[PDB]
Amino acid sequence: RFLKVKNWETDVVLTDTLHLKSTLETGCTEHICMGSIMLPVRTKDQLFPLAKEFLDQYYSSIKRFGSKAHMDRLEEVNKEIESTSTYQLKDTELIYGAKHAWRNASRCVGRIQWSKLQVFDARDCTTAHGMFNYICNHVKYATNKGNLRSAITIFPQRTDGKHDFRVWNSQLIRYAGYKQPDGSTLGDPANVQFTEICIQQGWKAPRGRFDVLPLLLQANGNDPELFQIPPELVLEVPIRHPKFDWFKDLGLKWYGLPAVSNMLLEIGGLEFSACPFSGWYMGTEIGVRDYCDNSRYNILEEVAKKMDLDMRKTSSLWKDQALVEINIAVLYSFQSDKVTIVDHHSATESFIKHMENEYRCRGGCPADWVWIVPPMSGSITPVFHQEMLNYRLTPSFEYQPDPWNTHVWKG
Amino acid sequence: RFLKVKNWETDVVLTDTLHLKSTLETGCTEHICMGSIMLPTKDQLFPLAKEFLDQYYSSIKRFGSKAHMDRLEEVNKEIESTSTYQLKDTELIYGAKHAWRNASRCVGRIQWSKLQVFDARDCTTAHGMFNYICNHVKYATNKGNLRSAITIFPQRTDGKHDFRVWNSQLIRYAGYKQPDGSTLGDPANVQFTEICIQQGWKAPRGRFDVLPLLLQANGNDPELFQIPPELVLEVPIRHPKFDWFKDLGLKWYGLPAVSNMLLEIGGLEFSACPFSGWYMGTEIGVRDYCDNSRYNILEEVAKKMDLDMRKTSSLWKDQALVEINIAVLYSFQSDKVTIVDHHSATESFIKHMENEYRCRGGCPADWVWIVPPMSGSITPVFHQEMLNYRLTPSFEYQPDPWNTHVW
Ligand code: HEM
Ligand code: HEM
Ligand SMILES: Cc1cc(N)nc2cc(-c3ccc(CCN)cc3)ccc12
Ligand SMILES: Cc1cc(N)nc2cc(-c3ccc(CCN)cc3)ccc12
Ligand SMILES: C[C@H](O)[C@H](O)[C@H]1CNc2nc(N)[nH]c(=O)c2N1
Ligand SMILES: C[C@H](O)[C@H](O)[C@H]1CNc2nc(N)[nH]c(=O)c2N1
Ligand SMILES: [Zn+2]
């Protein structure tokens, strides 16, 4: 079966066959679409088919399908599963798997870069202190003094689910949020719950508006431990505006390195529950979502006031005007400090090129329109008019429940 | 099977049961989501009629009543006899109002129950069609105090006698090609503008030329009709702060009246059913003016604002887009023509969603089309999970007439 997608702005039509190689479910049925729903222990029984599928993928990509090297690897993995109940990936397979998990991330607009991922093998790690050292080196490598480099660090895989490696932070670098007694919030409201956990674990909070949170790290199923990222490793950009000299007086800054640390990496049936990864920001992630979401820093009105906008009715689009100025300021600040950032026009244009390339060379590119389209100025970017197909390929990055809900506390 | 939708801005959770009443199919499977794809006899007719009449008589609390059973019997007889059936006026109004209520792509559904339905099923000719359409335009326009309306022409019989309005909207600006290169007028309508001249029209080859109507009655060849100019309410577009904005020479019409969809009720098909409401500001300023495949005056506005168009990272396209949209709302408001901005409409839709979950058990909603084409995440619909499913009565797409019409 073949499936066509149409770009309505250029009439380019593309044909997807890669969706046939899809395995997992989407949540949709023939009678309901859950395309806008945010989020819609494993035995030897089902593991070797999952391994064999991955290994067939891997050796196809290295043009060794059906080789002796291929069959011997299958046989070796077979004996390892039946004997030890799991198996280990070779370094080659792990690198391939992590790159293809990003390549298959249907919600990621930055996947033109998928093949330039630096993979850090931390599968020899055994303790929370060892995890912190690996994460510090990831942060330093990835940051590269503002010339950001994509990277992933991979901690040991799940075994019986009772010994997981977990990073309890959702991102490696994030600002604390503090609920005040008067109902207001100091800092980042998205991080109030995590901040409270950290304080409960003994973190001495500075209680400022831009406090970098400590790392809460869990090795081999033990209780998590706090570590402070050395401040010299946390690159930050003060936010100023190219025309408005009062914008600096807002006292805003952001960190340069987006590094998501709460997702699960799946490769050949193995589950890597601790696998922080990082790229560089698209400007709107900071300027639209991190600053102007009602449930975040919510500086729209303060910017709108300082601009002396008509804030009396929404039809003055004072909210839209303030939003664009904030996003100009975020991009100006980052470029001025020579810290890698991409605007949402450049990023979506590149993604369209990536997508067309993927259709030609790979026969498809799974893509989640609901997430690919930028959160402002959607239709003046070229992804808005691009039909997309969403389906789940493996290797993949998956969601996982927050560890404080599932962890069994030692004490 | 009793599904949940979360709003991530407020944590409000709603439980959907209405989807279990979904009949048609979505295009998605458990292996692939197609949520971003734009497009999808005597037997099956009586179950269709029964399901619809069961809906209708429940809504008036007459389910399993004398009137209900007799009507089902009456319709069943007329189907066995005539192979089709006719809707009572009350059923026709209900079916039309619920087709809008079910339109998962429509952000303006909070108004669904206040739809003025014009029964045009006695129409027999394109001249009659033109008359009914003129009365529709004047009623809906209402000197700028716009009123929602639908006019329903005779239902399809055997596909040979279809009533069709060939325009995609009752009021749209012409689109002419070029010996030069690109396009004068509206590029969206280039093909239709051809099939007007190629069908007889005399184009004034300007930029804001209101297209004639191309009306097809009882499956005959379509006929050209010019909509009386004094019924086409238009708004000159100025900006409340830029006075070179007027020099751009822009205007738009006040009445959005979509005329190419098909209205399905109780199995019956109405191929000509033009319906109208009033604009959300972004439909004109974001899409009609700024899409590359449309008027595309973005590059020209930004020049006039002396913005740095050398790098995309200056966000000049974004700054200009906002100003164009401020000007569209300003113009319509100044001329006392009904318009809604995308913040108010999406806020209204969240309240409508909450009402539908409360009093109906759900609301089919297409996030890809509900979220506005600018400033998406500062509107409340962005953070609202939606469930998309196809209820009936419904509005549906239909093929373009010229690709079908046995000439
Ligand atoms: C290199 C620059 C990159 C850019 C500019 C970029 C951009 C983005 C953006 C804007 C999102 C949407 C997040 C949101 O707005 O809430 C996203 C999602 C995502 N990105 Fe990328 N990304 C980059 C690199 C990477 C890398 C290196 C990985 C993994 C190795 C990755 C994996 C993902 C995944 C899995 C998601 C989906 C998360 C989810 O399902 O919630 N990205 N990306
Ligand atoms: C009264 C004010 C109304 C507003 C503000 C409104 C708003 C909108 C908007 C913004 C869209 C997206 C369309 C696009 O982007 O091209 C839409 C779609 C739609 N509207 Fe409404 N609308 C209104 C009235 C109505 C009425 C009266 C009907 C039917 C009786 C209707 C039926 C539809 C349908 C069927 C669609 C989707 C068409 C498709 O699937 O392509 N609307 N509406
Ligand atoms: C690697 C990478 C780079 C980047 N610029 N943004 C990301 C954004 C995400 C992401 C962050 C948060 C969320 C949910 C909250 N918006 C979903 C996805 C994950 C990874 C990213
Ligand atoms: C009744 C009504 C009012 C309004 N403000 N916009 C509409 C917009 C549409 C609409 C028209 C055309 C299309 C084609 C897809 N771009 C999609 C939706 C239909 C009816 C509308
Ligand atoms: C409910 C809705 O799906 C949810 O708010 C999604 C929409 N699209 C998104 N797109 C991006 N890039 N990031 C997001 O957090 C979201 N949130
Ligand atoms: C490709 C994509 O499905 C297409 O551009 C859709 C997306 N969302 C839309 N949303 C609205 N309201 N109107 C549209 O025309 C579209 N176009
Ligand atoms: Zn779907």
Side-chain angles (χ1 to χ4, degrees):
Chain A
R1 204 200 318 100
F2 280 47
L3 278 176
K4 316 204 324 295
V5 293
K6 187 178 178 186
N7 191 304
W8 287 89
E9 194 110 275
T10 64
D11 283 288
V12 177
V13 180
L14 299 171
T15 316
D16 189 298
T17 44
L18 180 61
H19 73 268
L20 304 180
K21 303 297 177 186
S22 161
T23 37
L24 322 169
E25 305 174 273
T26 66
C28 303
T29 76
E30 311 81 32
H31 298 97
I32 198 149
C33 174
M34 308 218 304
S36 71
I37 307 296
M38 162 109 30
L39 20 98
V41 47
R42 178 190 255 108
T43 55
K44 56 173 85 281
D45 191 311
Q46 66 270 65
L47 178 61
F48 185 83
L50 292 184
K52 177 196 199 304
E53 213 138 30
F54 173 74
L55 292 175
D56 290 354
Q57 279 186 30
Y58 173 69
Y59 284 84
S60 280
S61 74
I62 71 168
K63 310 295 169 41
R64 301 294 193 270
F65 189 90
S67 60
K68 187 165 182 295
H70 181 195
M71 294 303 152
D72 290 343
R73 183 59 182 151
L74 279 177
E75 257 283 71
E76 172 177 64
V77 163
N78 201 31
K79 295 161 62 175
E80 211 177 323
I81 291 170
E82 61 146 346
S83 154
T84 85
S85 266
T86 179
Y87 71 102
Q88 299 295 320
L89 290 172
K90 304 302 197 180
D91 300 14
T92 49
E93 294 156 1
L94 183 77
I95 296 162
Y96 173 91
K99 299 198 180 185
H100 271 74
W102 181 11
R103 195 191 189 177
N104 300 338
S106 58
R107 289 180 175 173
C108 177
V109 73
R111 290 181 281 169
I112 191 148
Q113 297 276 340
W114 71 269
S115 70
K116 294 135 215 193
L117 178 63
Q118 180 58 233
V119 177
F120 288 114
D121 193 345
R123 286 175 301 166
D124 62 9
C125 187
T126 75
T127 69
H129 277 84
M131 286 173 70
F132 171 70
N133 191 66
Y134 269 113
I135 290 168
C136 282
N137 293 347
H138 178 137
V139 167
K140 199 179 192 177
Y141 178 85
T143 301
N144 191 31
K145 302 191 181 188
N147 187 359
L148 272 40
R149 296 183 277 195
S150 322
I152 184 162
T153 304
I154 302 169
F155 290 108
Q157 61 202 48
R158 185 170 292 168
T159 52
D160 62 348
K162 298 179 177 182
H163 297 66
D164 293 347
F165 286 69
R166 296 297 293 280
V167 176
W168 284 38
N169 319 52
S170 46
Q171 285 170 46
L172 298 176
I173 297 158
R174 277 205 110 169
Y175 297 119
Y178 309 93
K179 204 83 173 295
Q180 304 288 72
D182 66 1
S184 63
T185 292
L186 173 63
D188 193 331
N191 303 318
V192 176
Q193 192 198 3
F194 181 75
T195 306
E196 286 169 343
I197 290 182
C198 290
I199 297 168
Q200 191 193 143
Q201 302 308 318
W203 185 52
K204 307 266 78 275
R207 301 194 64 89
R209 196 151 69 112
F210 296 106
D211 310 339
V212 176
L213 279 166
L215 287 169
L216 192 49
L217 306 179
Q218 160 185 342
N220 207 248
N222 289 320
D223 293 339
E225 318 185 9
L226 295 164
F227 304 91
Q228 180 198 142
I229 304 174
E232 58 266 46
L233 252 32
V234 183
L235 182 52
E236 299 181 297
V237 193
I239 304 296
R240 58 273 196 190
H241 190 279
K243 299 313 294 171
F244 303 153
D245 291 272
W246 50 257
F247 204 102
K248 69 174 180 301
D249 298 317
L250 292 179
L252 304 163
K253 61 176 158 174
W254 205 252
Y255 50 90
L257 177 67
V260 155
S261 57
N262 55 4
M263 294 193 81
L264 189 147
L265 167 60
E266 214 219 287
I267 300 166
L270 314 171
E271 295 177 314
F272 297 94
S273 57
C275 65
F277 50 80
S278 58
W280 52 80
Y281 267 114
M282 186 168 72
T284 54
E285 306 177 75
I286 307 167
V288 192
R289 308 303 314 288
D290 287 326
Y291 280 163
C292 298
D293 268 25
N294 273 314
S295 60
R296 300 300 292 279
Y297 273 80
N298 198 37
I299 71 185
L300 269 179
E301 34 238 351
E302 272 213 2
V303 166
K305 295 187 207 291
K306 281 260 209 294
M307 299 184 66
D308 201 53
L309 297 180
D310 198 321
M311 289 180 66
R312 281 186 280 99
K313 218 278 181 54
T314 69
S315 62
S316 83
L317 310 200
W318 64 267
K319 259 179 182 176
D320 313 66
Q321 258 180 328
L323 177 65
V324 171
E325 294 303 328
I326 292 172
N327 274 274
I328 291 176
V330 155
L331 295 163
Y332 175 67
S333 295
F334 273 64
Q335 284 159 358
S336 295
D337 290 350
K338 308 163 117 61
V339 181
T340 302
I341 193 157
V342 65
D343 63 83
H344 59 278
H345 298 292
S346 165
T348 47
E349 174 165 2
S350 294
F351 177 79
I352 287 299
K353 294 171 179 177
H354 172 63
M355 177 181 184
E356 305 172 326
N357 193 28
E358 287 287 75
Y359 271 79
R360 298 226 95 173
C361 83
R362 197 182 187 196
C365 184
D368 187 339
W369 191 106
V370 160
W371 279 69
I372 292 290
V373 175
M376 68 181 255
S377 305
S379 68
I380 54 161
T381 72
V383 292
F384 183 93
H385 312 267
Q386 178 64 56
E387 294 186 343
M388 301 167 186
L389 289 172
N390 199 15
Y391 46 94
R392 280 171 58 185
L393 298 178
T394 55
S396 55
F397 293 107
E398 308 280 12
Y399 286 84
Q400 46 181 350
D402 292 324
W404 52 92
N405 294 315
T406 71
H407 184 65
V408 178
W409 286 91
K410 273 90 205 83
Chain B
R1 188 146 171 184
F2 288 47
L3 291 171
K4 306 295 184 61
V5 280
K6 178 164 171 179
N7 180 303
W8 293 90
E9 186 190 340
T10 68
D11 286 338
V12 165
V13 185
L14 306 171
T15 307
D16 185 292
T17 38
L18 187 71
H19 74 283
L20 300 177
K21 302 215 188 64
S22 155
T23 41
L24 276 159
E25 291 173 357
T26 61
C28 306
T29 90
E30 348 103 299
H31 286 99
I32 184 159
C33 169
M34 308 219 179
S36 90
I37 311 293
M38 187 172 315
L39 302 167
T41 56
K42 287 190 178 228
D43 326 85
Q44 334 85 334
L45 186 45
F46 184 63
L48 287 169
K50 184 175 198 304
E51 177 223 323
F52 169 77
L53 293 173
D54 289 0
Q55 301 175 42
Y56 172 67
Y57 275 90
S58 191
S59 72
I60 72 175
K61 297 178 304 173
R62 288 285 176 275
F63 190 96
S65 83
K66 201 193 183 317
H68 185 192
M69 315 284 89
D70 292 312
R71 178 59 177 157
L72 225 100
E73 181 195 348
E74 184 181 38
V75 162
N76 192 321
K77 298 169 167 174
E78 184 181 351
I79 287 177
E80 293 242 347
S81 150
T82 48
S83 77
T84 173
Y85 73 105
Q86 304 297 321
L87 288 171
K88 297 264 174 197
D89 301 314
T90 50
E91 305 163 342
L92 176 91
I93 294 162
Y94 171 96
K97 285 182 182 183
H98 274 73
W100 182 11
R101 193 183 189 174
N102 293 340
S104 71
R105 290 190 168 160
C106 176
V107 71
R109 283 180 278 164
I110 184 157
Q111 294 280 310
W112 72 265
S113 83
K114 303 211 301 275
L115 177 63
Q116 182 58 226
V117 182
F118 293 114
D119 192 350
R121 290 178 282 163
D122 64 340
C123 190
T124 66
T125 72
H127 274 90
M129 287 178 74
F130 174 63
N131 191 49
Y132 269 107
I133 282 162
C134 284
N135 291 346
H136 179 126
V137 165
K138 183 186 185 145
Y139 174 84
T141 298
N142 196 29
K143 310 196 204 171
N145 188 10
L146 298 215
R147 295 182 293 194
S148 302
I150 176 165
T151 298
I152 305 169
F153 294 104
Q155 70 203 44
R156 172 181 293 131
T157 49
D158 38 46
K160 258 47 243 177
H161 307 358
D162 272 19
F163 282 78
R164 290 293 303 255
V165 176
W166 287 36
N167 314 46
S168 49
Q169 295 166 46
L170 300 180
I171 293 155
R172 274 194 105 175
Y173 294 122
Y176 315 95
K177 1 98 148 297
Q178 268 312 311
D180 190 292
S182 74
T183 297
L184 167 65
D186 197 313
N189 308 306
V190 169
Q191 185 180 26
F192 184 75
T193 305
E194 277 168 341
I195 317 176
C196 284
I197 300 163
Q198 188 248 324
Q199 268 280 86
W201 195 45
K202 189 184 61 180
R205 287 189 101 94
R207 178 158 62 158
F208 289 140
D209 304 343
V210 182
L211 283 171
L213 291 165
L214 236 199
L215 305 188
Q216 165 189 315
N218 211 41
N220 308 312
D221 294 351
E223 291 190 50
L224 278 185
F225 300 93
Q226 159 183 307
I227 301 177
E230 65 269 34
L231 304 190
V232 182
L233 174 55
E234 294 185 290
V235 176
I237 302 302
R238 57 272 191 195
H239 194 275
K241 220 43 217 79
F242 283 136
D243 291 12
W244 52 260
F245 214 89
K246 302 150 175 78
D247 299 358
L248 289 152
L250 314 168
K251 56 167 170 182
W252 207 254
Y253 48 92
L255 184 71
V258 148
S259 54
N260 61 5
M261 305 199 65
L262 184 158
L263 160 68
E264 204 176 90
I265 302 169
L268 307 179
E269 295 180 315
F270 297 95
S271 42
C273 59
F275 53 91
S276 67
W278 54 78
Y279 268 116
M280 188 165 67
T282 53
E283 301 177 270
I284 306 168
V286 181
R287 306 305 318 280
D288 290 340
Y289 280 167
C290 292
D291 281 358
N292 261 269
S293 49
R294 297 294 296 282
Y295 266 81
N296 191 39
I297 63 138
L298 255 185
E299 7 192 21
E300 290 67 32
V301 166
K303 223 88 59 57
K304 263 285 189 75
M305 303 174 62
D306 241 319
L307 298 177
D308 172 67
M309 306 174 53
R310 285 182 284 193
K311 303 175 295 85
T312 62
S313 59
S314 89
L315 307 192
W316 61 267
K317 296 199 184 179
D318 310 71
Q319 284 188 301
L321 180 78
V322 176
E323 302 300 333
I324 295 183
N325 276 265
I326 287 183
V328 164
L329 301 161
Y330 175 69
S331 297
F332 273 59
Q333 286 164 150
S334 291
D335 286 4
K336 312 135 191 172
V337 184
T338 300
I339 196 159
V340 66
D341 66 79
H342 49 290
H343 303 287
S344 186
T346 59
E347 187 211 7
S348 280
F349 176 80
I350 292 305
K351 186 197 170 191
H352 174 67
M353 251 187 86
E354 287 157 7
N355 293 330
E356 294 293 74
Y357 276 86
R358 174 178 50 99
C359 312
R360 188 184 197 194
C363 169
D366 182 336
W367 192 103
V368 174
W369 293 65
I370 304 302
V371 170
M374 67 178 274
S375 313
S377 74
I378 60 182
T379 71
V381 293
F382 185 90
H383 315 260
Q384 176 72 56
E385 296 181 348
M386 289 163 196
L387 290 175
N388 198 20
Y389 47 93
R390 308 227 302 171
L391 294 186
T392 195
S394 63
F395 295 106
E396 300 294 342
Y397 302 91
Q398 48 185 351
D400 268 334
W402 49 93
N403 295 289
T404 332
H405 179 45
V406 278
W407 254 98

